[PDB]
Amino acid sequence: ALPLDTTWHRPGWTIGELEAAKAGRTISVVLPALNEEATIESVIDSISPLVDGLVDELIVLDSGSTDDTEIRAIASGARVVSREQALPEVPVRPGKGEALWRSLAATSGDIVVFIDSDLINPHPLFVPWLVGPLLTGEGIQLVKSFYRGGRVTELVARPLLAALRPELGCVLQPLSGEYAASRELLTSLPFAPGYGVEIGLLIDTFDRLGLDAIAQVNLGVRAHRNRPLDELGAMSRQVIATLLSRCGIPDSGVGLTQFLPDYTRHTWPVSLVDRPPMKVMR
Amino acid sequence: ALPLDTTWHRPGWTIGELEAAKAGRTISVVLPALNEEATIESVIDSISPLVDGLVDELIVLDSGSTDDTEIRAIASGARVVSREQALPEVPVRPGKGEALWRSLAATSGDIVVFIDSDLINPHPLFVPWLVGPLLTGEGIQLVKSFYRGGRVTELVARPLLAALRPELGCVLQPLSGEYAASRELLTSLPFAPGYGVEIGLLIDTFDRLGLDAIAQVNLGVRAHRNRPLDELGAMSRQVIATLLSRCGIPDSGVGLTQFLPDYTRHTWPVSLVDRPPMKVMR
Numbered sequence: 001a002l003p004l005d006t007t008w009h010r011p012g013w014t015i016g017e018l019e020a021a022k023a024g025r026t027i028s029v030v031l032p033a034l035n036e037e038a039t040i041e042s043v044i045d046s047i048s049p050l051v052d053g054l055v056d057e058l059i060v061l062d063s064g065s066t067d068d069t070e071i072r073a074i075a076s077g078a079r080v081v082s083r084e085q086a087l088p089e090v091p092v093r094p095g096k097g098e099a100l101w102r103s104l105a106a107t108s109g110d111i112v113v114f115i116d117s118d119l120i121n122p123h124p125l126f127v128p129w130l131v132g133p134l135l136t137g138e139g140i141q142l143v144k145s146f147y148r149g150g151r152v153t154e155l156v157a158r159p160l161l162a163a164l165r166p167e168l169g170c171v172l173q174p175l176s177g178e179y180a181a182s183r184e185l186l187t188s189l190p191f192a193p194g195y196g197v198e199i200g201l202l203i204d205t206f207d208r209l210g211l212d213a214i215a216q217v218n219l220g221v222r223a224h225r226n227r228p229l230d231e232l233g234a235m236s237r238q239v240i241a242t243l244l245s246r247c248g249i250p251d252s253g254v255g256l257t258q259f260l261p262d263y264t265r266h267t268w269p270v271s272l273v274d275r276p277p278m279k280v281m282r
Numbered sequence: 283a284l285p286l287d288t289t290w291h292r293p294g295w296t297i298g299e300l301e302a303a304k305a306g307r308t309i310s311v312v313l314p315a316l317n318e319e320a321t322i323e324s325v326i327d328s329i330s331p332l333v334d335g336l337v338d339e340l341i342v343l344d345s346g347s348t349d350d351t352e353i354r355a356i357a358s359g360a361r362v363v364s365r366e367q368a369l370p371e372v373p374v375r376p377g378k379g380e381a382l383w384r385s386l387a388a389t390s391g392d393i394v395v396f397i398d399s400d401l402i403n404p405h406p407l408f409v410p411w412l413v414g415p416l417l418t419g420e421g422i423q424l425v426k427s428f429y430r431g432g433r434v435t436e437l438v439a440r441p442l443l444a445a446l447r448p449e450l451g452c453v454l455q456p457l458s459g460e461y462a463a464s465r466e467l468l469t470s471l472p473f474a475p476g477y478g479v480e481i482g483l484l485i486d487t488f489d490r491l492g493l494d495a496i497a498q499v500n501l502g503v504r505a506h507r508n509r510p511l512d513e514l515g516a517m518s519r520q521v522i523a524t525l526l527s528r529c530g531i532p533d534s535g536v537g538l539t540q541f542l543p544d545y546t547r548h549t550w551p552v553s554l555v556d557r558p559p560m561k562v563m564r
């Protein structure tokens with residue numbers, strides 16, 4: 001009933017059916033992590049039993065953690081890849097977008113799956129539920145999750161999409177950190193910086209491929225780190241810079257400033273520079 | 283230290299000085315009200331002692347309340363004006379913007395002051411603190427308040443202004459419902475619909491007059507009705523439609539849709555139609 005292929009109830013496929021449907025295609029899972037020692041182990045544990053089966057490869061993309069994220073991830077049996085190790089020839093920029101872009105060179109799966117590592121008790125069927133439409137359907141090359149926080153999504157992204165890309169008004173969680181896509185697509189797209197990356201991939205895929213190439217799946221309920229408003233303001237600023245750039249609208253490039261007392265002025269970084277398609281780095 | 287004339291500490295002027303400084307100029311106060319029976323009395327009480335003094339006129343602009351807002355406001359000694367009564371020749375549209383636009387025909391003050399009527403225990407010095415820069419300074423024609431909720435402001439408006447009108451990045455509460463301005467300015471500007479009006483007046487004033495004509499004043503702490511996220515999403519959508527329109531960016535005109543389960547789809551209204559300057563209705 002939506003213009004977007006949408007699985008509403010717990011998808012029917014089993015691990016075995018999906019594993020059969022792979023048909024030579026490989027699957028890589030990437031957990032980007034910046035200081036998530038408190039949750040990373042449960043997130044890895046919820047996925048590592050699929051390894052050597054449905055999943056051929058699982059990595060943690062360590063985006064410069066200074067806490068005990070790496071040693072706990074290792075202790076959970078996960079391969080940990082720094083931004084440096086993933087693509088040593090290129091100096092590292094900050095932001096999640098960078099990490100996701102770099103994870104493309106540290107993985108070799110025909111299908112790449114992303115899962116945020118700050119999720120509190122993720123369901124072990126997240127990955128299957130996410131690769132469902134890619135494996136069985138035809139035409140699908142991007143799968144976003146949806147779920148029943150949510151402030152930047154409900155106040156910035158979905159209303160802006162309503163404003164500038166109404167065709168995507170039916171995407172329920174455009175910023176979801178849990179999503180999957182073909183390597184062919186991901187290596188063809190540029191990667192927006194910082195927190196601009198999701199909204200960047202959505203608009204670019206659609207612009208390049210239309211809604212038929214996009215699916216979304218219900219994963220139930222999502223719980224994650226509740227961040228302070230100033231950080232969300234910064235994130236919201238970058239989401240806006242990337243969305244505006246994809247719509248052909250010039251963004252000033254000026255970072256958001258916040259005040260909190262004569263007074264204490266702080267400016268957050270914002271970037272208008274995308275990383276190119278990983279294809280060009282062959 | 284900001285490019286915007288900013289009074290940070292409780293402004294020094296007294297009621298008497300300000301009353302002296304009027305010099306023939308009149309002051310109208312407008313409280314727009316849509317179903318605020320629980321708070322309207324305290325808001326009127328905090329202002330009515332200035333009437334026949336500093337304030338020459340106080341009205342409640344009733345924007346179609348079906349609760350006991352009108353009878354309580356009357357019982358507090360306030361003149362209550364319906365949208366119909368304010369400008370009977372023109373059929374009524376919904377939204378706050380409409381109410382504020384209409385209040386221009388029901389008032390006759392050289393200076394018009396706006397105060398939201400959902401404020402919990404407002405300080406009786408709000409109006410003086412707001413008319414301070416208009417009465418004493420020269421050049422000022424718009425005064426916004428600022429204060430230590432705030433989600434649409436911190437995630438949508440200030441970051442968008444950072445994106446498209448960085449000169450206003452130093453405006454602390456662009457959506458504040460408490461603000462004052464000259465009749466000359468207000469009757470010269472168009473009024474954006476619904477919740478687009480504040481952000482519409484800010485961008486238009488600045489575009490027409492630059493920062494020097496704009497001031498902002500600290501009123502301390504603001505407390506008001508906490509609204510559910512779907513309503514804030516709708517509000518945020520209209521703020522975006524108006525901001526995009528003022529920046530020369532085409533808005534789709536498609537209202538934001540929300541889902542909440544096979545499912546229950548609702549679309550909120552959005553309007554791309556401004557009311558013209560009240561001047562043209564002479």
Ligand SMILES: O=c1ccn([C@@H]2O[C@H](COP(=O)(O)OP(=O)(O)O[C@H]3O[C@H](CO)[C@@H](O)[C@H](O)[C@H]3O)[C@@H](O)[C@H]2O)c(=O)[nH]1
Nearest residue numbers: 032033034036063095096099116117118175176177195198
């Ligand atoms: O520089 C960074 C920043 C974040 N992350 C990781 O990215 C994930 C998401 O970051 P988070 O701070 O939890 O973002 P959210 O506020 O939850 O943002 C939501 O909305 C964002 C905008 O699209 C998405 O990027 C997020 O994935 C999504 O969870 C977390 O695992 C982080 O550890 C990094 O690896 N590197």
Ligand SMILES: O=c1ccn([C@@H]2O[C@H](COP(=O)(O)OP(=O)(O)O[C@H]3O[C@H](CO)[C@@H](O)[C@H](O)[C@H]3O)[C@@H](O)[C@H]2O)c(=O)[nH]1
Nearest residue numbers: 314315316318345377378381398399400457458459477480
């Ligand atoms: O159709 C309407 C809607 C609202 N109001 C009144 O306007 C005021 C503000 O509305 P509110 O629902 O409290 O808005 P907020 O979510 O608090 O929005 C904040 O941000 C908005 C966007 O600029 C401003 O319009 C508001 O004044 C400001 O308080 C309240 O007194 C309402 O009674 C009306 O008179 N008519």
Ligand SMILES: [Mn+2]
Nearest residue numbers: 116118224225
């Ligand atoms: Mn998170």
Ligand SMILES: [Mn+2]
Nearest residue numbers: 398400506507
């Ligand atoms: Mn309010």
